[PDB]
Amino acid sequence: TVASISSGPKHTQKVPILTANETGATMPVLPSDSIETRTTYMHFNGSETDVECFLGRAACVHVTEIQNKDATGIDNHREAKLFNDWKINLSSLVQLRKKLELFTYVRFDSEYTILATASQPDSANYSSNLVVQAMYVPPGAPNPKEWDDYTWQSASNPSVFFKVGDTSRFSVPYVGLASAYNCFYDGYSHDDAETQYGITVLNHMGSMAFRIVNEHDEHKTLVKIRVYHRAKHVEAWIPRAPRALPYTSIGRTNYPKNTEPVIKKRKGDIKSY
Amino acid sequence: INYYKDAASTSSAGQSLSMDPSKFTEPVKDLMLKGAPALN
Amino acid sequence: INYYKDAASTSSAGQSLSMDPSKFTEPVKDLMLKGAPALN
Amino acid sequence: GLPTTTLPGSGQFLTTDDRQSPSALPNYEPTPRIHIPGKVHNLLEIIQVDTLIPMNNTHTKDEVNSYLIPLNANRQNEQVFGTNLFIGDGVFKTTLLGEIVQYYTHWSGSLRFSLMYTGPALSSAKLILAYTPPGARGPQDRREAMLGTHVVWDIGLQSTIVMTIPWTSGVQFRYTDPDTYTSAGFLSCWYQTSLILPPETTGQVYLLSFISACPDFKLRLMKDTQTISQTVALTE
Amino acid sequence: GLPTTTLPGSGQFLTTDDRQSPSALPNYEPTPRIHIPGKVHNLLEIIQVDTLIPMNNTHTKDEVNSYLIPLNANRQNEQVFGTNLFIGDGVFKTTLLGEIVQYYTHWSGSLRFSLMYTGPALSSAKLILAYTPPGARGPQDRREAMLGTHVVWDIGLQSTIVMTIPWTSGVQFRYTDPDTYTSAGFLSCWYQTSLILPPETTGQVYLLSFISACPDFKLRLMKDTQTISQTVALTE
Amino acid sequence: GPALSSAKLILAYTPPGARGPQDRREAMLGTHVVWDIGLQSTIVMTIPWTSGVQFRYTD
Amino acid sequence: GYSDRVQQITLGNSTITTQEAANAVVCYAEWPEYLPDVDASDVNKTSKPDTSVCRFYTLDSKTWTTGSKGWCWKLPDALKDMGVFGQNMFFHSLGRSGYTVHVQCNATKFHSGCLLVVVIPEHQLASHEGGNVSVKYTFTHPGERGIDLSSANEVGGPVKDVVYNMNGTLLGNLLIFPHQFINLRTNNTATIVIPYINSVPIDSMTRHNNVSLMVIPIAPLTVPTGATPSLPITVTIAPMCTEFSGIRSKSIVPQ
C-alpha cells in the first residue's frame, strides 16, 4: 500500500485544495495535492484501532465489599454487608464509560472477571479460606434478604463459587432487550410528567449479589470484590463528540455546576507558539 | 478450537478490516469531485 | 471427545428440537378443523 | 510432560456450565425405558394449553368464584371486566402461563384470551372484547374501547370466543416482571347490546375465561420464580 | 491421565489476553440485529471527519469565541495566529482528533488543517499559511515563514482552504504526549496582501479552523487518556 | 427589487372547503411553494385542479 | 447549467426552491426507507398516509440577533401539531419516520455570520442542577417552539450552555454529526435528509424523540452599517416514508 505517491510541480485550473466546508463534507485532501512528494508505503494496517480491539480489554467496572462475621443479632444482613449487590451498570466507573459513549448504540457479549481479596484489619490468628458466591438475580426474581436464604439456592439462577484471592470468569451473551444497548436515550418510560429521564430507565437488567458461603470464624474478615468487564464481538453505531466535562450520575449526561474551563488558555497571544 | 457450545463464549472477534469513512466524511447528496469547484 | 467410558458421564443432551403440543392442546378423538364449526 | 498455563476462572464452580465427569457407578446398567404417553420436550409445548384465569379476583380468600366473571341481564353500554396485561402478575400470575413466564426474564409473542359462555341456552348476548395497545389509558367507556383491537362476540351455539392479543411492540421483548417502558396494554369487555334471559329464568350468568400463548411466543433468560420460597429445609 | 507441567504465569489475569469462557446463560437467544445507519469499524474512520479547533484560546472561561480567529481590515505584512503542533495538547487537545490521539501512545501521518472564511461576500483577502518542520523556531515574520511549507490562500467564492501538514520526520513515529525529540513543528498564518472590507461595512471578520487526519495516519499502542478521571464511583 | 437584495416568500393555494388562511401556519398546510429570490427572477406556481365536480361555473 | 446551488424539493403537495444551496447532506449516507419485514417485530399491518403526512411543515420563525445563543428542536416533537402528521402521532401506539429538514436564512453581500445546522441522534440533555436531577418531560417536548438556548435556566428543564451541547461535550465536535453550515457569504439554506435511526424497528412517537435539530450562530451576525441588527431564521421540515402502527384511543401526554 502506498502512503504517498510521487507527485511533481502543478500549474493547473484544477485546484483540489479550495473547497466549501459549508457542505458538511471533509474532502479527502493529501500531501501530494499541495507539495511535491516521493513514494512511501504504509507498512501498517490499523489493526489496533478496530472497535473490537478498542473495547476488547478488561476494564474495572465495580468494586464492592462484603464481610464474614457472626450474623447473630444482625437485623439487616444487607446493611451489615453480610452480603451486597451491584445493580449491574457500566456507567459507575468513568474510564470505560467515556470510551463506550464515543458511540450511541453498542452491541457485544461480555466476559466478566471477578477478583476477590481478603483483608483482616484487626487482630486475627490467621487468614481463613472463604468461598464467594456470585449469583445474578434477574429482574423479577426473589431478592436475597438474608445471607443463607432460600434464594442462594439459585436453582434456576446462574451462580459461580470461587475462592477469595482467586478469580472467577465467564462470559455472557448480549442480554439487551433491543437490537443494541442504548448509550444514550432521549426519552422516558411513559408519557408522565414526573417520570425519570435517560437510559437509567432503559438499563434495568437486575443486579448481581455476592456473599461468603463460609460461616464465621472468631475474627472478622473483609472481602472486597472487583468486577472487570471485557466486550467481545463488538458492534458500534453512530459516533458522537467525546465527553468533555466530568460525570455526576450513572445514566444522565449531567455535568457539575461551576465546573472549570476545559479548554487550556494560552500563556500568550493567539500569535504565540 | 471452540471448547464451548455457545457463541458468546468464543474469544474476541478479528479485524473488521472494513473501513469506509465516507458515511462520515462525505455524506453529501450530489457527489463532490476533488479538483472540481465545490460550488458551481 | 468423551474422556470417560460410561454414558452418564457425558455432558448435557442437545435440544430435543422435538416440539409437538398437539398431545396436550388437541387430544380430541374426531379431528377439529379451525374455521369449521366446533359442534356440527 | 506437556507445558500448560492455567487461566483466570480455574477451579471455579459455575452452576450452569456443562462438562463431563467420572461416573461413580462404573458399568451399571439402567432399567430399560418402557413407553409412557405424555412426553414433554419444551416448556413452549405446554404454555399453549389454555387454563382458567381467576379474573374475578375481588374476593378475600381463594374461592372457585374468582374464576367466574358475572354478567347482568338487561344492562346496556356498560363494562364487564378490565385488567392490565402484566402476564407475570395480578390475574395472570397463578395461571400455567403466568406460572411459567415467571421462570424467564423476557417474553415476546401473541396471547390467546378466550371466554366460554355458560348461561341458559335460550338466552342471548353480544359482548365486545377490546385490547388497548401500550400508550393509552385503560379505556373508560366502549367508545374509547372500540377504537383499538376488538371482537364483537355473538353468543350462540358455539360457546367460546378466542380473542388474540397480537404482539404490538416497539422493543422486541418485554420483561415478565411488570415494567413500564416494557408494558403491554389493557384488556376490557363491555356489553355490545346486552344479555337477555328467557322467561322463567333469573339472576346472574357467568363467563369462564382462559389464557394460553400463541405459537408466536418466545421466553428467554431463565431465572428463579418469586412464586415459591422456604425458611427451613423440609423433613420426612 | 495425560502428564502436564504448568508454566510461570499460570493463574494470572492479564486484562488484555483473549480466551474462551463458559457462558453463564447456556442456550439463550439474543435479540435479532436490525439495520441502523452509521456503523463505525475503526477509530481511523472517524478521525478523518474534520472538527473545529478552539484556536483563539486566549479567553478565560470556555466560550464560543475561542473558535473564532479574528482578522483586521487593512493590516499588511502581519501575523494572524501561531501554534506548535503538539496534537495531544494545547489547541488540538479537545478536538476529536486530539481526543482520540490521546487514547494512543504513538502517531504518524499527515494532518489536514483548513480555514473557512466568514467575512462579507464583497470583501477580499490573501493569507499565507506556513508549516515549519521541526528544527527551526516558530517563524517570527512572513519572510521567515514563507521559506517552509506554505499555501497563498486567495479568499473567494470557494470559502475554505485545506492545508496539509505533510509528514516530515526522521523517526517514523512521534509520541502523542508532547515530547521534544519527537516534536513536529509550528503552524503560522500572515496577511499576504491584507483583508479589505466593502463600504458600509465594519469591524472584525473571523475565520473558523478545522483539523482532521489524512488517510496516511497511523496511531498505535493504546493507553489511558489524561482527559478523564474521577474521585468516587458514580451513583444513580 | 435591486439585485443586491434578497427575500424568501411562500405562496399558498387553499383548496375549496377551508377559509382564506389567516396566518402562514394556516397557509403552509395546503399547496405552497417556498420561493427563494435569486438570479432567476420569476417563480411559477400552478393551482392544480382540485375538485369534486369536473367543471366549475366562470361566474 | 445545473449548479450545486439551485435546488427544488417537491414532497407531497408542497415544494421548496433554493437558489443558493451548498449541496445537501444525507445522514450517514442513507436515505429514508420503510421498515422491511426481515426487521419487523409487531405483527400489525402499518398505515402509510403518504402524501398527507409527507409534505413540508414550516415552523414559526426565529430571530437571529447579535446576542443569540442558538435554538434546539426535537423530532418528532416539533411536528406534534402539524396537520394529519400530528393526529396520526397521537392516535397510534407506534410510528416511524425519516425527514427532510430545510433551514433558511438570507441576508445580503454586506452581512457576515455563520450558523451550524446539525442533527444529533439520541440527544439526551443534561439537567443544569448537576447530580442526578432529571429533566422533566415538558422541558424536552417544547413542540414547534423548540428550546431557546439563550432563555434562562428553569426548574426541571435542561441546561442551555452552548459550548457544551446541552450534554457535557464541546461545541467544536458537533461536526462529527451530519451537519451543514449557513455562511451568509456562501449559503442561504441548509438541507439534511434524516433516515430513521433507532435500536428498535419502530417506537413510540411521544415518549422518545430520536433526533434534535440544532441551529447555532458560531460567527456572530454582523450587519452592514445602520442596517437593522437582526435576520429571521425559518425551519421547514417534512416527514418522509412515515408509517404508523397500533391504532387505538389517542394518547394523553403531560401538560
Ligand SMILES: Cc1cc(CCCCCOc2c(Cl)cc(C3=NCCO3)cc2Cl)on1
Ligand atoms: C450497556 C450495558 C451492558 C450491560 C451488561 C449487562 C449484564 C447482563 C447480565 O450479565 C450477567 C450474567 Cl448473564 C450472569 C452473571 C453471573 N452468573 C453467575 C455469576 O454471575 C453476571 C452478569 Cl453481570 O449493562 N449495560
